[PDB]
Amino acid sequence: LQAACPESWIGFQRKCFYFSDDTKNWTSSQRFCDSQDADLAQVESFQELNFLLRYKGPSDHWIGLSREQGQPWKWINGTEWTRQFPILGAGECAYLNDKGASSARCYTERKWICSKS
Ligand SMILES: [Zn+2]
């Protein structure tokens, strides 16, 4: 069985997911997730990516992947991104659109996805 999640959260595999209604910048989105004892979505596989794309909706959604320029992608914990899928764009913060994962300026405002075990 998949994980049992709190209200308004969706269970997938060993994680619970929250799809936001409103828009925030990347750091503010992470701040929301942290307040829920969670983090911006840690997308560790293509299966996980497809799940999110399926249930995300039309708007772009922040996820928990960021990089300083000319540095590799990093999850929130600090572990280096393991290249499971391509991340288009030249931005510092990663988000999901309808097609896949892209990147943008962190101060732009988007919906977001939180995840936790
Ligand atoms: Zn945290």
From Swiss-Prot:
Membrane topology label: Single-pass type II membrane protein
Primary location group: membrane
Domain of life: Eukaryota
Gene Ontology, cellular component aspect: cell surface; endoplasmic reticulum; external side of plasma membrane; membrane; plasma membrane
Extracellular-side positions: 1-117
KW Endoplasmic reticulum (keyword) present: yes
Keyword Ion transport applies: no
Keyword line: Cell membrane, Disulfide bond, Endoplasmic reticulum, Glycoprotein, Lectin, Membrane, Receptor, Signal-anchor, Transmembrane, Transmembrane helix
Induction of expression: Up-regulated by IL1A/interleukin-1 alpha and prostaglandin E2 in cultured osteogenic sarcoma cells.
Tissue-specificity statement: Detected in peripheral blood leukocytes, osteoblasts, lymph node, thymus and spleen. Isoform 1, isoform 2 and isoform 4 are expressed in T- and B-lymphocytes, and at lower levels in NK cells. They are also expressed in B-cell lines and LPS-matured monocyte-derived dendritic cells.
UniProt-annotated location(s): Cell membrane
Protein role: Receptor for KLRB1 that protects target cells against natural killer cell-mediated lysis. Inhibits osteoclast formation. Inhibits bone resorption. Modulates the release of interferon-gamma. Binds high molecular weight sulfated glycosaminoglycans.
Subunit note: Homodimer; disulfide-linked.
Protein name: C-type lectin domain family 2 member D
Source organism: Homo sapiens (Human)
